[PDB]
């Protein structure tokens, strides 16, 4: 995943088999070192 903090993102094609892509908005995720982004909304995630 490409997580952008307090901004936006654009998908991009990669002509692979059954290439699903979806951009997401409203994520507040965790890693081991605590939270990744800080803006509650305005976060972004890409699932390919």
């Amino acid at each position: 995943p490409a997580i952008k903090c307090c901004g936006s993102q654009e998908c991009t094609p990669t002509y692979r088999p059954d290439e699903q892509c979806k951009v997401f908005t409203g994520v507040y995720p965790f890693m081991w070192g605590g939270a990744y982004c800080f803006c509650d909304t305005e976060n972004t995630q890409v699932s390919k």
Partner: antibody
Amino acid sequence: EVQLVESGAGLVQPGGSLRLSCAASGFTFSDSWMSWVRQSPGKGLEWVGRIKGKPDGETAAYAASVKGRFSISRDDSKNTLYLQMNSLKTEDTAVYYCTRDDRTSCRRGVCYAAFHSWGQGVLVTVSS
Amino acid sequence: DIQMTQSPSSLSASAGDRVTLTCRASQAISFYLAWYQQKPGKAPKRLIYDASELQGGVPSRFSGSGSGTDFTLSINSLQPEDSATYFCLQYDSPPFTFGPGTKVEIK
């Protein structure tokens, strides 16, 4: 904040030629789907056109009422989106908006992009 | 051309309440609906895209839910900065048709 500024509008001798331009700044320009929309009195918003990026060939899909008359021709040497309108009718006049189209899901190659951003808008006056 | 209907067209209310809006479609558009907003003499604003993903910059009292031909736009709290015309967008198959609009007003 993506920046967009409409320019080149005003009064016209109808049935003829005209140009509008959108001097953009705030995103990767040569990898950007961009589009136009127009708003009419008494009638809502009509999509006019969408131009594609250099990784697709700078192709341009249009609408029904404008095939062969409206043509989009961008250029990467200057971040600016052109629209060279031709053979003006009496309903073509409308408040135009240049827009950016962020792609949000690519399902089996062909992608799908809404209208993210907008310009301030400009008035085109087709009368006599 | 997918002729939409942006129904209702007059759904005024008062503060603190809840209100909804519909943009129903002929063909089955999967989730590629975008609820927008417009104000007097200003440009529009993307509110919700993909029917379930709120745009970055929009207060959370708006919310999306729907698929196919039937969709919603739930305002959990109509504070008075929402005097506006709300639209709906379709970007699965050209032409990129909109609904006519709904003129949400207040007094």
